């Protein structure tokens, strides 16, 4: 299974050999199991977990009842992780960063930074047309978007300008530089999706 964490930011770790490792600091506070899904009731085996804290006024009555049944305190959100056949958890159990103590590589999922509406040059690495040499008002424009009477349309999935970022992204096979249970910190090599303070789902690498 995996844990939910927050992106504290980025830094470096200097090795004695003198290699500097780019690391992303992920704060993995204890994740409290709010619900356990089973094949009999839900048709799939999974655990729902919460992390962090939520303002009591901000928590709604329907949300509060779900937390109350678990016996856990309200967390900022609810996330599910699918269970392997061997794995077994109980409602109210807390899972810490020590889970990843023996995990060499992890996959980190987060919402990418939102770029808003983006042109084809930025979004799809389209080439710009000539800056000079007579180009009329068509420096960063997409160019042709189709053929002619055949097929007489634009095909679906045509790369065009539109929203860029603010989407779920996974970076796979990131090395685990350090696991710190005392500080509730997971240090992973390299950049991970999202801005500082964003929610990060960390799992053991599938590959």
């Amino acid at each position: 299974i995996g844990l939910v964490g927050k992106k504290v930011g980025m830094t470096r770790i200097f090795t004695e050999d003198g290699v500097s490792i780019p690391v992303t600091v992920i704060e993995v506070e204890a994740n409290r199991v709010t619900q356990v899904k089973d094949l009999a009731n839900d048709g799939y085996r999974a655990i729902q977990v919460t992390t962090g804290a939520k303002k009591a006024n901000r928590v709604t009555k329907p949300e509060a009842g779900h937390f109350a049944k678990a016996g856990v305190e309200a967390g900022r959100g609810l996330w599910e992780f699918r269970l392997a056949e061997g794995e077994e958890f109980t409602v109210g159990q807390s899972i810490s960063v020590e889970l990843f103590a023996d995990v060499k590589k992890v996959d980190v999922t987060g919402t990418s930074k939102g770029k808003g509406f983006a042109g084809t040059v930025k979004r799809w690495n389209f080439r710009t047309q000539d800056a000079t040499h007579g180009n009329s008002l068509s420096h960063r424009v997409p160019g042709s978007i189709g053929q002619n009477q055949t097929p007489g349309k634009v095909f679906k999935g045509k790369k065009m300008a539109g929203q860029m970022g603010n989407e779920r992204v996974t970076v796979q096979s990131l090395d685990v530089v350090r696991v710190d249970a005392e500080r509730n910190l997971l240090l992973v090599k390299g950049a991970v999706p999202g801005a500082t303070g964003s929610d990060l789902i960390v799992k053991p690498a599938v590959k």
Partner: protein, 114 residues
């Protein structure tokens, strides 16, 4: 912030000497050839200093074998064994990029006497 600051502070060197732009400094750097590890010295004017905690860096410019060489060092990196200010220089600017276009008598820096 505070979390990263704690992590950054734990790795930071406490022996880093005071140096300013325009100072002539010698940086001893660890160099490994095969099994053997030795200290190589790089001596030149400090032309730029970036103050950024653990991410602090400084740039040293020398003329070596008739070729101008600039080396950006990570201050708190273990590779840098030691830093020593050979001479203190009197300049008015933080960054000495103008020294890149100057050679010989033009590139001379006055000593700061205090």
């Amino acid at each position: 912030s505070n979390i990263i600051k704690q992590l950054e502070q734990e790795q930071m060197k406490q022996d880093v000497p005071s140096f300013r732009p325009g100072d002539t400094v010698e940086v001893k750097v660890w160099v490994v050839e095969g099994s053997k590890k030795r200290l190589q010295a790089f001596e030149g004017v400090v032309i730029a200093i970036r103050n950024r905690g653990l991410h602090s860096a400084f740039t040293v410019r020398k003329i070596s074998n008739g070729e101008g060489v600039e080396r950006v060092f990570q201050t708190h990196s273990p590779v840098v064994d030691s830093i020593s200010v050979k001479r203190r220089g009197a300049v008015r600017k933080a960054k000495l990029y103008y020294l890149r276009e100057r050679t010989g008598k033009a590139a001379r820096i006055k000593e700061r006497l205090n």
